[PDB]
Design a protein around this nucleic acid. Structure first.
Lengths: 204, 154, 222, 116
RNA sequence: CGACUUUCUGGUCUGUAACUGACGCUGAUGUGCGAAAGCGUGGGGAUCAAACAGGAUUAGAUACCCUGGUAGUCCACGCCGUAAACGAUGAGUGCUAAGUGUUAGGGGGUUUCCCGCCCCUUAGUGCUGCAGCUAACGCAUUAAGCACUCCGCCUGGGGAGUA
RNA sequence: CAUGGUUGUCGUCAGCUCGUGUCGUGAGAUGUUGGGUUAAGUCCCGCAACGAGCGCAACCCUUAAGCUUAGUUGCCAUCAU
C-alpha cells in the first residue's frame, strides 16, 4: 500500500523483534504457542493497558516483560496476583513462564497507551476532537520530537467515513534513524469500527 | 498585565475552499483604554485569542469626563461614519452594536451616538476607534495652546 | 565629543534623489552634488553622544547593523569592540527581536554546535555531516543577525535607512529610539536622533561608529 | 494544430509584415531586403516568422540584434492594422530550408557522376 | 486642422509696464459653431465602396474570402444637429513636497566667442512620485487634495428613451 | 454507497502545507514570485514579507577497490599424496 506501518521496516535495524526464541525448523509450534499467550494478554490489557510484551525463550524457560500503564496492582500489594497469572499462563501454554513486569516509561508519551486511551475516550461518548487536543497538548508538554494521531471511520455518530490528522513538529518517516513507535487501536459505541494509529517520534 | 474585558463582535466562517473562522474582538479595561483586533484560525477559541492579542497591541486612550466624552466628534473610516456626542449622567449609552460594544468597553457610561453610512462591523469599529482617538481633552488643549484652564473651559 | 575638522573631513552626498523636507539642512549646493551643513551636524553628534552615554549608563542595549557593503566589517569590529551584537548580513523582518521564530534558529545553531562538541564529526557517517554542516553554515550566513540578545531591542543603530526601512519600521512599531548615520535622501521624521552623515564616506562611518562605541563604553564603565 | 483560418491569418500577416519591416523600420541602421514566411498555432497566440538575409555571419547577427529591439514597433503597428483580437508574440528565425534545400540539391551531383 | 505660394483674418505666449482704474467670474432663456452618415438642387466622379450581381466556403452562409459595382466618398449653396462628441473628469480663482523629459520665449553666470553648457523663470505638453483623497483601481501643482463663486445633471434594475 | 484494517492506479508525479511577523478596510496576499542552476519545491542571488514542517535526497541493504579478525566442511603460494 501507499503507507505501511513503519515499525515493520524499523525492526531488525535499531529495534528488536516483538517475539524472540531460538531458531529451528519447528517454528510453527513456537508461533502457535506464542499466539495463545498473545491472545491471553487481553485480560491484563483490559485493566492495565499494557502496551506490548517481549517474550523470550530460554533453554527450557520462558521470559516475558509487560509494559503496564501502572505497576502498583499488576505487581499487587505484596504479590497477591502475579502468582495466579503465572499459574494461568503455565496451564494455558502447557509450559511455565518467568514474568518480569516493568513499568512503561514514566511519561505517557508512548504510542499504544495513548491509542487505547483515546479509543476508550471515543467509546465513552467524548468528542474525539477535544480528546485529540488534550493528547497533543500533553504530548508536547511531556516533550516529543514528533507525534501524530490519525482516525478513520464514522466519527461523531455519522454515516460517512472521514479521516483526520493532527501532527506537530518534525516527523521524518522516510528517514530510518527515527526510532518511532507505531500503534493501532479500534473503538466504537454503536457504529461499526473506528481505527486510530498513533505515531510517536522520541529521539534519533 | 491587568484585567481587561473582551467581547466578540462577529464570527464568520469565510471562504476563498479553505473556509475557516475570523473573529472581530474589542478589548477594553472600561477605565479609559480600548482596542480592537481581528484574528483568523481553524477553531473559534484560538481565533478569539489571536484577536485579543492583536487588540492588546494597539490600545487607545479615550479622554474621560465623568464617564462621557469631553466633546462631540465624528469618526470616519472609508464610508464608516459614526457620530457620537456627550450626554448628561443617566442617559445611557445610546449606540449600535459594534459602537455600543467599544463605547462600554472603553469606560463610556452615557453618550448619544449614531452611525452614518456603512454598517459593516469592521469599518464601524474602526470608525468609532478613530473618533475616540481624535478626541481632545480640555486640560491638554489648554496646555497645547499658550493659555491655561480657569479662563476658558467646557 | 566631536571635532570641527573631522566634520570638515566629511564631505558631499549622493545626488540622485533627495527628501525635500530636508531641503533646509543643505548648506550650499555645488558641483552638482548636495552637501550637508556640518555646523548643526556637530551639535546633533554631541547630543547623540551624550544621549547614548546616558542610555548606556543605566544598562541600555543598542544593536549595530551592517547590511550595506563596504561597511559590514567596520560595523562588526565596532560591535565586538563595543560589547554588543552585530548584523553581518541582510536584516530580515524581526531578525533581532525573538518574535519571528528566530529563537528557534539560534537554538538550532546552539544545539548543532554543541553536539559536535559532544561528538558529531567522524563518529557519525559522512552521509549526515554533509548536510548538517551545510545547514549550519547556511544559518550562519543567512542569520546575519546571529546575536546573543534576549529578545530585548531597547534601542538600535541604523547605518543606512534606505536599506533598513524594515529595521526602522519595526523600531517605530516597537517604540524604541533610532539613531545612526542618515544620508541626503533618508526620512528624518521616522528617526528620533538624526545624524546627517554620508554613506560613501567609509572612514567617516568608521569614525562615527567608534564614537558611538566610546559612548557605550563610558555608559557601561559608569 | 492548424486550420484554414490560421493559414489565412498567416498569409495576410505575411503581406503586412513584409511591408512594415522594409518600409517602417528605419532606426535600425542594418536594414535588409528580406523575404518572409509566417506560421501560427491554431489559437493565433503564437506566430513564427521565417526570413532570409543578405550578408555575412556578423551582418545576420547585427540585423537580428536590431529586429530584437524593433519587435515592439512591429507588434504595435501590426495590432493597429489587423482585426485579430489577441496579438501573437513574434520571434524571428532564419529559414534554414534555404540552405538545407540547397544542400539537398548537392547530392544530385553524386547521382549524375556515378551514372556518367 | 499636415504639398507649396500669395491675399484676407482670428486667437495665444514672453519681457517691459507709463496707460484706464475692478471695467471682473459664472451664466437659465437666446443665438451660433458642431466628426461621420443622411436629405434637396446642381456639378464632378480617379481610387475606394453600403445596396446589388456572380463565384468561393459551409450541415446551412443570407456573412467573413474573391471578382465587379450604384448611392456615396469630392465641390458650391441649403437642411439635418447626432457620436465611446471621451480626460468617460463644467467654467473661474487661490494654496499645498519633489524628481525628470519636451515645445515657445526671457534673464543671469561661465567660456574669447554659445554652436556649445550650467543656473533662474513664464506659459503649454509628458512620465514618476509625498502629504491628502478614494470603496478600490487610482488622482496627485495639467488633483479625482485643500477652499470659495456660478451653471448643468442624479436619486434601485426592467418597462423605457417607451406612450 | 455503514466501515475499520489491508491493497492497487496516477507515481518515485514533484509537489502539499503551516507558524510568524506584517502588506491589504476586507476577501486575500506572501512565503511557494523573479534570475541563474538540477531529472527533483536541489543550491545560490535578490525578495517585508519572513520563518518553519511533510514531501525529494541522504539515512538501509546488496554490490564495485581495499585493509584488519577468522580459516572449516572451503582454497592449494610452497609442499608430499
Amino acid at each position: 500500500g501507499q503507507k505501511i506501518n513503519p515499525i515493520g521496516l524499523r525492526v531488525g535495524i535499531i529495534r528488536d523483534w516483538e517475539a524472540k526464541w531460538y531458531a529451528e525448523k519447528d517454528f510453527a509450534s513456537l508461533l502457535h504457542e506464542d499466539l495463545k499467550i498473545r491472545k491471553f494478554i487481553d485480560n491484563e490489557l483490559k485493566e492495565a493497558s499494557v502496551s506490548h510484551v517481549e517474550i523470550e525463550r530460554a533453554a527450557n524457560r520462558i521470559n516475558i516483560a509487560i509494559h503496564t500503564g501502572k505497576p502498583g496492582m499488576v505487581i499487587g500489594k505484596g504479590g497477591s496476583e502475579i502468582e495466579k497469572l503465572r499459574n494461568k499462563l503455565n496451564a494455558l501454554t502447557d509450559k511455565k513462564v518467568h514474568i518480569n513486569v516493568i513499568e512503561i516509561k514514566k511519561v505517557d508519551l508512548d504510542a499504544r497507551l495513548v491509542a487505547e486511551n483515546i479509543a476508550r475516550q471515543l467509546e465513552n461518548r467524548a468528542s474525539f476532537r477535544r480528546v485529540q487536543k488534550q493528547a497533543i497538548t500533553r504530548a508536547m508538554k511531556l516533550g516529543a520530537k514528533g507525534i501524530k494521531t490519525q482516525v478513520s471511520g464514522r466519527l461523531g455518530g455519522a454515516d460517512i467515513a472521514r479521516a483526520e490528522q493532527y501532527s506537530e513538529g518534525t516527523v521524518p518517516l522516510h528517514t530510518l534513524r527515527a526510532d518511532i513507535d507505531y500503534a493501532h487501536a479500534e473503538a466504537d459505541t454503536t457504529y461499526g469500527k473506528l481505527g486510530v494509529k498513533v505515531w510517536i517520534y522520541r529521539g534519533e | 498585565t491587568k484585567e481587561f474585558e473582551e467581547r466578540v463582535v462577529t464570527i464568520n466562517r469565510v471562504a476563498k475552499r479553505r473556509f475557516r473562522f475570523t473573529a472581530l474582538v474589542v478589548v477594553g479595561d472600561k477605565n479609559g483604554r480600548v482596542g480592537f483586533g481581528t484574528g483568523k484560525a481553524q477553531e473559534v477559541p484560538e481565533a478569539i485569542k489571536k484577536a485579543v492579542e492583536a487588540a492588546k497591541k494597539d490600545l487607545v486612550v479615550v479622554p474621560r469626563v465623568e464617564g462621557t466624552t469631553p466633546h462631540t466628534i465624528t469618526g470616519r473610516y472609508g464610508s464608516g461614519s459614526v457620530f457620537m456626542k456627550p450626554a448628561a449622567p443617566g442617559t445611557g449609552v445610546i449606540a449600535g452594536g459594534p459602537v455600543r460594544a467599544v463605547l462600554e468597553l472603553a469606560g463610556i457610561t452615557d453618550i448619544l451616538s449614531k452611525s452614518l453610512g456603512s454598517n459593516t462591523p469592521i469599518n464601524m469599529v474602526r470608525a468609532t476607534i478613530d473618533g475616540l482617538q481624535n478626541l481632545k481633552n480640555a486640560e491638554d488643549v489648554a496646555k497645547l495652546r499658550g493659555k491655561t484652564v480657569e479662563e476658558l473651559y467646557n | 565629543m566631536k571635532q570641527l575638522l573631522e566634520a570638515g573631513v566629511h564631505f558631499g552626498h549622493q545626488t540622485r534623489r533627495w527628501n525635500p523636507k530636508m531641503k533646509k539642512y543643505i548648506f550650499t549646493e555645488r558641483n552638482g552634488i548636495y552637501i550637508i551643513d556640518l555646523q548643526k551636524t556637530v551639535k546633533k553628534v554631541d547630543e547623540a553622544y551624550n544621549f547614548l552615554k546616558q542610555v548606556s549608563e543605566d544598562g541600555g542595549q543598542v544593536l549595530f547593523v551592517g547590511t550595506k557593503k563596504q561597511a559590514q566589517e567596520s560595523v562588526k569590529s565596532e560591535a565586538e569592540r563595543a560589547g554588543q551584537f552585530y548584523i553581518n548580513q541582510r536584516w530580515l523582518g524581526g531578525l533581532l527581536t525573538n518574535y519571528k521564530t528566530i529563537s528557534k534558529r539560534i537554538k538550532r545553531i546552539s544545539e548543532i554546535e554543541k553536539m559536535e562538541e559532544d561528538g558529531l564529526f567522524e563518529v557519525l557517517p559522512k552521509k549526515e555531516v554533509v548536510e548538517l554542516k551545510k545547514e549550519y553554515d547556511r544559518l550562519i550566513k543567512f542569520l546575519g543577525g546571529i546575536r546573543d540578545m534576549k529578545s530585548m531591542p531597547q534601542a538600535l543603530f541604523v547605518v543606512d535607512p534606505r536599506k533598513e526601512r524594515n529595521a526602522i519600521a519595526e523600531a517605530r512599531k516597537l517604540n524604541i529610539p533610532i539613531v545612526g548615520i542618515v544620508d541626503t535622501n533618508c526620512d528624518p521624521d521616522e528617526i528620533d536622533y538624526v545624524i546627517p552623515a554620508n554613506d560613501d564616506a567609509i572612514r567617516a562611518v568608521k569614525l562615527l561608529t567608534a564614537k558611538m562605541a566610546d559612548a557605550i563604553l563610558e555608559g557601561q564603565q559608569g | 494544430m492548424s486550420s484554414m483560418r490560421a493559414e489565412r491569418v498567416g498569409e495576410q500577416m505575411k503581406k503586412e509584415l513584409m511591408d512594415i519591416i522594409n518600409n517602417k523600420v528605419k532606426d535600425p541602421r542594418v536594414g535588409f531586403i528580406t523575404i518572409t514566411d509566417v506560421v501560427l498555432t491554431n489559437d493565433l497566440s503564437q506566430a513564427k516568422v521565417f526570413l532570409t538575409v543578405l550578408g555575412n555571419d556578423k551582418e545576420v547577427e547585427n540585423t537580428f540584434k536590431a529586429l530584437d529591439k524593433a519587435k515592439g514597433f512591429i507588434k504595435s503597428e501590426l495590432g493597429s492594422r489587423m482585426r485579430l483580437r489577441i496579438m501573437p508574440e513574434l520571434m524571428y528565425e532564419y529559414d534554414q530550408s534555404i540552405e538545407y534545400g540547397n544542400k539537398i540539391e548537392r547530392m544530385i551531383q553524386d547521382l549524375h557522376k556515378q551514372d556518367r
